[PDB]
Amino acid sequence: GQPSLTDGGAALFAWLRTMRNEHPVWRDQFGIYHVFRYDDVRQILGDYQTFSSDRTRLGKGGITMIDPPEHRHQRRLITHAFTPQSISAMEPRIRQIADHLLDELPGPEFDLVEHFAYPLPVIVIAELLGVPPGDRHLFRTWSDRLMSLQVEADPELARTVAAAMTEMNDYLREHCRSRRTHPRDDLLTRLVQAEVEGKRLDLEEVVNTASLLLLAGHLTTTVLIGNTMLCLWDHPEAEKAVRADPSLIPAALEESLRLRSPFLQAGRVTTRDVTIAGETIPANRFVMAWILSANHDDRRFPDPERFDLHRQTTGHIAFGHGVHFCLGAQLGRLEGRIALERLLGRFTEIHPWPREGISFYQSAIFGASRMPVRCG
Numbered sequence: 001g002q003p004s005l006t007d008g009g010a011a012l013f014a015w016l017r018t019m020r021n022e023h024p025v026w027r028d029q030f031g032i033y034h035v036f037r038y039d040d041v042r043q044i045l046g047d048y049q050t051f052s053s054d055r056t057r058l059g060k061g062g063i064t065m066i067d068p069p070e071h072r073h074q075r076r077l078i079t080h081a082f083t084p085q086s087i088s089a090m091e092p093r094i095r096q097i098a099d100h101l102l103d104e105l106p107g108p109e110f111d112l113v114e115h116f117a118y119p120l121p122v123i124v125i126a127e128l129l130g131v132p133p134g135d136r137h138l139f140r141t142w143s144d145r146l147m148s149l150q151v152e153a154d155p156e157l158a159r160t161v162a163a164a165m166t167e168m169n170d171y172l173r174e175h176c177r178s179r180r181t182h183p184r185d186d187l188l189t190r191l192v193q194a195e196v197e198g199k200r201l202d203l204e205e206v207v208n209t210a211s212l213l214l215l216a217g218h219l220t221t222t223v224l225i226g227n228t229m230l231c232l233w234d235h236p237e238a239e240k241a242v243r244a245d246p247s248l249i250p251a252a253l254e255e256s257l258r259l260r261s262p263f264l265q266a267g268r269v270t271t272r273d274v275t276i277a278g279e280t281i282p283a284n285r286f287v288m289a290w291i292l293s294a295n296h297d298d299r300r301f302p303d304p305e306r307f308d309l310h311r312q313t314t315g316h317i318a319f320g321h322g323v324h325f326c327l328g329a330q331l332g333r334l335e336g337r338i339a340l341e342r343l344l345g346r347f348t349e350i351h352p353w354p355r356e357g358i359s360f361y362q363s364a365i366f367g368a369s370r371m372p373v374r375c376g
């Protein structure tokens with residue numbers, strides 16, 4: 001990511017455009033190939049046969065790291081329980097969890113990430129999974145100790161992370177063996193009870209699917225909520241129209257997703273040689289598919305750096321493409337919408353404070369880790 005991520009991105013944007021225009025396929029000093037254009041990133045993401053996801057071979061048994069046909073048979077059991085109707089019924093819970101957050105903010109000057117956008121995705125997974133409310137602080141604890149994986153070295157960090165994972169995996173496991181004996185109406189209970197053509201996730205694939213949702217739908221949603229407030233702040237005409245018409249909160253989320261996509265890249269391993277934009281990547285190499293440049297590619301999104309609420313061309317690969325397309329996009333959108341509805345609903349006045357107090361993650365997640373605001 002060959003500039004500094006800490007000026008909002010303006011510098012990365014500029015660097016991508018050139019990389020797009022003049023090196024749409026680039027072998028980095030580590031042997032890693034990068035692809036920057038929309039058509040090419042999309043191409044890689046959907047062709048699971050050429051570009052494999054078993055990046056281990058140069059959650060190892062789970063859906064982010066296996067491929068079809070096996071990938072298709074496991075994810076169809078998850079989606080058995082992760083139904084779109086169950087995600088929609090989630091809406092009143094999300095609204096309540098966002099009102100509680102807002103009700104408890106520490107006065108009119110606070111950190112909009114720490115005290116709202118950072119906790120809400122975690123509380124929501126935890127209420128979806130069936131975690132009793134009084135256990136829900138333990139989850140916040142674990143996502144704090146585990147966020148190194150969402151972001152992505154030293155042995156120290158690795159060891160502490162592995163032990164946070166054991167802790168959580170024993171809590172979950174025990175918490176699934178109970179849903180087998182005392183079924184409840186949580187997501188957990190649907191997993192344990194899914195069955196497709198006479199097959200069942202075993203108890204461990206449930207645990208691992210649980211930890212996966214936690215860690216996948218957490219920080220991505222946090223930056224989505226942060227980032228969309230950053231877009232409104234950098235475009236006062238847009239924040240005008242959204243406030244005077246919250247009907248536009250969905251449109252604003254889409255454009256935020258394009259302009260400031262939470263997930264920067266996606267990595268596959270090449271299963272054969274292949275020519276991409278007149279460059280040829282050898283087999284058994286590692287490829288880095290820049291979801292962010294694609295979403296900023298002029299060839300398809302005119303004025304990529306402009307925040308337009310009424311773009312003619314839609315179709316951003318913020319959530320990806322192919323068989324691995326984000327299993328939570330539906331849920332993620334909903335979280336963002338409700339939470340923005342509430343936040344802007346509750347404060348006519350939300351200003352950065354200071355505007356130079358924002359800091360950003362440095363990693364695969366693109367957005368603010370700190371967002372001090374002042375409200376009224």
Ligand code: HEM
Nearest residue numbers: 063064216217220221224262266319320324326327328332
């Ligand atoms: C703003 C919100 C989100 C964004 C931008 C986002 C982005 C993405 C992207 C780009 C991928 C594709 C990875 C790849 O193809 O290599 C992905 C996969 C995935 N996401 Fe999301 N995600 C979001 C929220 C969520 C949520 C809320 C959940 C669940 C609660 C979730 C669960 C997953 C899972 C399980 C996968 C892997 C699917 C598979 O490997 O077949 N994500 N996400």
